Design a protein around this ligand. Sequence first.
Ligand SMILES: CCCCCCCCC(=O)OC[C@H](COP(=O)(O)O[C@@H]1[C@H](O)[C@H](OP(=O)(O)O)[C@@H](O)[C@H](O)[C@H]1O)OC(=O)CCCCCCCC
Ligand SMILES: CCCCCCCCC(=O)OC[C@H](COP(=O)(O)O[C@@H]1[C@H](O)[C@H](OP(=O)(O)O)[C@@H](O)[C@H](O)[C@H]1O)OC(=O)CCCCCCCC
Ligand SMILES: Nc1ncnc2c1ncn2[C@@H]1O[C@H](COP(=O)(O)OP(=O)(O)OP(=O)(O)O)[C@@H](O)[C@H]1O
Ligand SMILES: Nc1ncnc2c1ncn2[C@@H]1O[C@H](COP(=O)(O)OP(=O)(O)OP(=O)(O)O)[C@@H](O)[C@H]1O
Ligand SMILES: [Cl-]
Ligand SMILES: [Cl-]
Ligand SMILES: [Cl-]
Ligand SMILES: [Cl-]
Ligand SMILES: [Cl-]
Ligand SMILES: [Cl-]
Ligand SMILES: [Mg+2]
Ligand SMILES: [Mg+2]
Lengths: 667, 667
Amino acid sequence: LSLKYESLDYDNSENQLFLEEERRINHAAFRTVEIKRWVICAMIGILTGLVACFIDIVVENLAGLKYRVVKDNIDKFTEKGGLSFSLLLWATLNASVVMVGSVIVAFIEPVAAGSGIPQIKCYLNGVKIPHVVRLKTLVIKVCGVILSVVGGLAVGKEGPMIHSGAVIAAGISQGRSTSLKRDFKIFEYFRRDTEKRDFVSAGAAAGVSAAFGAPVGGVLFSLEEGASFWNQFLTWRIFFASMISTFTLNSVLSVYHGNAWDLSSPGLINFGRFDSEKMGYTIQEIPIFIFMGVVGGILGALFNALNYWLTMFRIRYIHRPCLQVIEAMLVAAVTAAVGFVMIYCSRAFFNTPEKSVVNLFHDPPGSYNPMTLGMFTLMYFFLACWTYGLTVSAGVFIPSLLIGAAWGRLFGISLSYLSKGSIWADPGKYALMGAAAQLGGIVRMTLSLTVIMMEATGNVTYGFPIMLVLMTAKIVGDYFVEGLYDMHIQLQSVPFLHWEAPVTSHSLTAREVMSTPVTCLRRIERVGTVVDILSDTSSNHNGFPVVESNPNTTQVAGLRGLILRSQLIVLLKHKVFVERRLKLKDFRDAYPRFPPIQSIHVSQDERECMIDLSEFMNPSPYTVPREASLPRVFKLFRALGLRHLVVVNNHNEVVGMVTRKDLARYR
Amino acid sequence: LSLKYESLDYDNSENQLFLEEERRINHAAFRTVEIKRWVICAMIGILTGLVACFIDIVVENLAGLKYRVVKDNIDKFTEKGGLSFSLLLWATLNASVVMVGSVIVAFIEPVAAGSGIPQIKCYLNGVKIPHVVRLKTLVIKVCGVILSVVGGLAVGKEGPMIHSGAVIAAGISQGRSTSLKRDFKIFEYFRRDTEKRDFVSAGAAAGVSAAFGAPVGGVLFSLEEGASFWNQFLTWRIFFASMISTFTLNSVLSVYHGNAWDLSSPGLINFGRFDSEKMGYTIQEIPIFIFMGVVGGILGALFNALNYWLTMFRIRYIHRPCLQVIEAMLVAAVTAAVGFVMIYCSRAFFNTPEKSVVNLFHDPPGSYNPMTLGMFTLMYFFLACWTYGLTVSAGVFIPSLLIGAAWGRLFGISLSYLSKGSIWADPGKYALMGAAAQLGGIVRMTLSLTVIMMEATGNVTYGFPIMLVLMTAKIVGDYFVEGLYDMHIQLQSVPFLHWEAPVTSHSLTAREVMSTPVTCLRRIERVGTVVDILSDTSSNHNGFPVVESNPNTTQVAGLRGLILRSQLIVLLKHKVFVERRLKLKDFRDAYPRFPPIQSIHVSQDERECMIDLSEFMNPSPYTVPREASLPRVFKLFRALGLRHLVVVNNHNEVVGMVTRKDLARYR
Ligand SMILES: CCCCCCCCC(=O)OC[C@H](COP(=O)(O)O[C@@H]1[C@H](O)[C@H](OP(=O)(O)O)[C@@H](O)[C@H](O)[C@H]1O)OC(=O)CCCCCCCC
Ligand SMILES: CCCCCCCCC(=O)OC[C@H](COP(=O)(O)O[C@@H]1[C@H](O)[C@H](OP(=O)(O)O)[C@@H](O)[C@H](O)[C@H]1O)OC(=O)CCCCCCCC
Ligand SMILES: Nc1ncnc2c1ncn2[C@@H]1O[C@H](COP(=O)(O)OP(=O)(O)OP(=O)(O)O)[C@@H](O)[C@H]1O
Ligand SMILES: Nc1ncnc2c1ncn2[C@@H]1O[C@H](COP(=O)(O)OP(=O)(O)OP(=O)(O)O)[C@@H](O)[C@H]1O
Ligand SMILES: [Cl-]
Ligand SMILES: [Cl-]
Ligand SMILES: [Cl-]
Ligand SMILES: [Cl-]
Ligand SMILES: [Cl-]
Ligand SMILES: [Cl-]
Ligand SMILES: [Mg+2]
Ligand SMILES: [Mg+2]
């Protein structure tokens, strides 16, 4: 959709240098590479769990400090100023914390804004958003989520965990820090995009597991996002990482909050225990659940749609960082004022959202007055909608669950009245169902969310109902608007590939999808020609088919290989011309950041030399016939994580190039 | 490995007829095909659950009848004959039930022998074992498992559920019964191997879910076996089927055993509830668990190895059906005698294995004397080893879990003695760990088994230890011998593709793997030539590349398509010669069973005619370069479920053919 975004080189080039390295590795007499992958996955899990522990502990302590300071100060300030004076003071306190958070996000690292989940979804899809995996981004994300939660915004701390795990996985796998310019001479074999994308999948799964105490759910989330060929080894490693993440979080928290290692804190949010007779559903109740799904599908849409409009306003008028900070402060102040009006009219805004969700799930039937619960539902709905897109590190999972739990507990109260206090009409069960439905409507997650809800709930039997609502919420929701993360991905104009091609696509063939004419390089090519092709500012192609150079062959453009701009740049830098032989490490040294063609200097004498690309080109590029259905091209492209696909004639002559933007256009 | 086994045509041929059908389907103005897939998955789940209910209820009633008959008869027979007389009578009773079961297996349908899991694994791998999915096979399997369990063999009823679900999925999806020669004019679009293999995956997942009450575990089992490109839609449907299977089983059983629908019977085997303080592991205990894994890895090997030798004897000397029935009777009699000696020396053989496993898991610390528990462990180990390969419908999961639980509860008793009755040294927790370790050693299942154990246990926290043991059991076990299901697959000589190619395979290239010379067909081909190629009894190739026929092109064997023996047979039958136009249904009519080439009659005048294969050939065959690494060929072959892969020159001239046996040879 936009050229700002490049793509990962997931499909490794099995060139001659790579095969030489593999021969030496096999001769090594021991395959330590897999053991190193395992050690890296363990470290990823441990570090993600420790990040979750840090956030939880710091948030708890700072929230306690805010509560203590205001509890001490209210007497003094209300004695003379009055209630309104204390209202203003507390609102300014919240605004100040949110101000620091929004400053660090807008003025230092705007990528840190939000949960990070859309960015990680794009990364696992195969698109590289500029600063998603950086040390600065992780630091800003963690600090900002702490400051946002302490600042009393309608936000949650679960979402940033996925992004933090992804960044940790990308970082520690390399063995070196580009930001700190420190190289630890380890894990050099894993300085390639394939291994990095595997480790990031592990890290995202670990983040989900630490967030919700849902290991299998995290594994399934990573599998969904990747949408690749099945690798038993990688899935098992991801499972290992997720398990260690949840284990580390639980153990450390148990040692902290309690004085024993007994495991009672699987995740950052813990729903509770639902193993009771009152929380048992009958077949007669299955239709009822489905209906709530419809509701969650509609309300969710109304959420997303509203945000869309809000987002546009922010793109039009709140583009500036200073205005962004001011808007975040204003939202925080209005949230505080709504809370005060709430609290003084009633006789949860001060309390954590997770505790409110738990109480809604498990409190006895007569706990809540319907009127106040509905007021909270409406106000929190509109506040969460007005908070998602702010330049603050925050998530939307817990807010969505809270909204759903509230209106589900209202539905349960109404059912209990209508059914004369029946055991089957228990408000907490319907609160859980409503939480699932609202989260599904706002975010269209199906398998991973079902498994996550089952694990957090702790019951496997509740999965079948949770499934049916999550189904319906999607089916109804997709009727009106697209999902939140998708919506923001479209707005950012990222080239995003969906699970499958548009249904009416068997009509289309690669001939329509492919791009022509194609810029190709002869196997033995003049240095000047390569320099001119790469130096062109009209286009910034990063993959070039390598065609026959000998005059003997009949083929006009017979496909011999595919080479990349990065490899050509390395070769030109090292002046590897036919007129010290490179090793696969020499290419890995440039990684991740490759010098621009402008940097390389090629003298007119050197411009007349030649480059032989046979030793460095990918000898075997993936190829499709020109008369091939679009679904097949899409399936092959997505499954293998290809960056370039070559469309050829019957005679194996290059006729076109299919890339990510070629397949993303149709929708 | 052997030519007795063909392969599924999972990769659909997007020929002209298929595209015409898709255009008409799109013009239909409503896509009911997906809705029909959903309805079929729901029916699969319901029917699998009902099969599980039938087996459970019938087994319970018949076991009660046996217990009542013997309880009444022992007084009368022991009064005059003595204890030995009653011993003989009861042994003969068990032998008679096992005799009926073994007769129906050996003399009617030998495929029904065993769990069916190896056969379903092969089917999902892509190999077609002759009678795996047949009505007769399902009937025999269910009856035989009932008779084996009622006959007191060291067997379990869980394993046949996977096979039964697979057969149901294959059957009801077609809309017609070949065995009963009845056609219900429904589900005609799904009479192709792709849809059948998807439905069978759903059915296998449903079987696992009904067996262990583990929906997600069943989904993961199916995903592991398929090892294909990720399809969100298919995975979601499989999840739907598994959930409905467990729900139906639980609901029906609750209505039967209780008088209320309250859900308390998720699966055929139910471990129990482990949410207690005594069943809580510490970090200090993590190493201990690992050690037990090693034990489970070693013992499991000793199991498998022994069976191997036994299997050989049975292949050499107990090949005959009558001898097979006699051997099953002898094993049953020896099992009964061991039970009697057991029972009279002590003062579980009469009791169900599942109840014994549950009691071992949950009974209080002082329940079992170590001496008798060890005697049972050893005797049951050797009896289960001597029972797995019998011509009786049976499984090995529950026996393995029982063995592991027994020696794990011995390990826990020893730990309690050594640690002076510590709370951390609780025998039941170690019994669960030992069950997992022994099952892992005997069967090398890693992810699906971990998730299944977590769900059956009901605790997510126990997964991390259960993982570590299951890891170690595999790593140690693979050091000595291969897994049981694998071992039997090798012995049957089925061409089985593993998850990845041998590690030292980058050295090999398609040129080594591919088969030459290749038998190809010109696009316009003489009918006599096709008849001769298909009539050859030297080879039975089922896939033929279609090369250029026009003299104009330079290519000697330019690849234009791929056609199949079945399609050619249909065309010859309908005399579709250039010298009524077929519809995609006409090919589906022959499916599943295609007439042999011998059946078709072609007159000498017709032999001189021509066939144009363009409208029917697969216009776009998957292709790889001759200079391509074996890992890549293997990855593409396994991910896309290909039956044929064409290896071509730089000029796109056919040079070789890679099939399943080509890639399975290297090991
Ligand atoms: C108690 C909390 C635990 C905190 C853990 C923090 C670790 C994760 C982290 O916060 O990051 C680590 C930074 C890397 O950050 P980094 O700024 O250098 O980012 C580059 C680069 O910038 C690319 O960015 P780009 O693609 O945009 O060009 C990007 O892709 C690429 O993945 C990155 O390596 O240090 C390290 O490596 C860690 C040293 C590992 C060696 C010891 C192993 C034992 C564990
Ligand atoms: C309460 C217990 C529930 C019992 C359910 C039993 C249903 C499953 C079953 O036991 O099987 C059904 C048989 C098919 O057995 P079948 O012998 O004809 O086998 C052929 C053939 O033989 C191929 O065998 P092959 O490949 O070796 O040549 C094989 O692949 C291919 O899948 C098979 O269709 O009847 C049916 O279709 C069911 C009618 C469905 C229409 C109503 C839909 C509403 C539910
Ligand atoms: N060698 C080539 N010859 C002609 N067109 C090309 C070539 N490579 C890419 N294109 C086309 O140019 C357009 C822009 O491509 P771009 O330069 O972004 O490729 P890229 O950056 O390598 O792709 P990605 O960033 O997704 O890996 C695409 O629509 C693509 O079809
Ligand atoms: N058209 C062909 N020309 C030459 N050799 C072939 C051809 N097709 C298959 N072979 C080779 O013949 C051997 C036996 O093949 P077979 O006849 O079993 O193929 P098939 O039955 O179509 O394969 P499958 O049963 O696995 O689908 C294989 O090792 C294969 O490489
Ligand atoms: Cl974000
Ligand atoms: Cl959140
Ligand atoms: Cl979020
Ligand atoms: Cl079997
Ligand atoms: Cl079993
Ligand atoms: Cl089994
Ligand atoms: Mg680009
Ligand atoms: Mg064959």
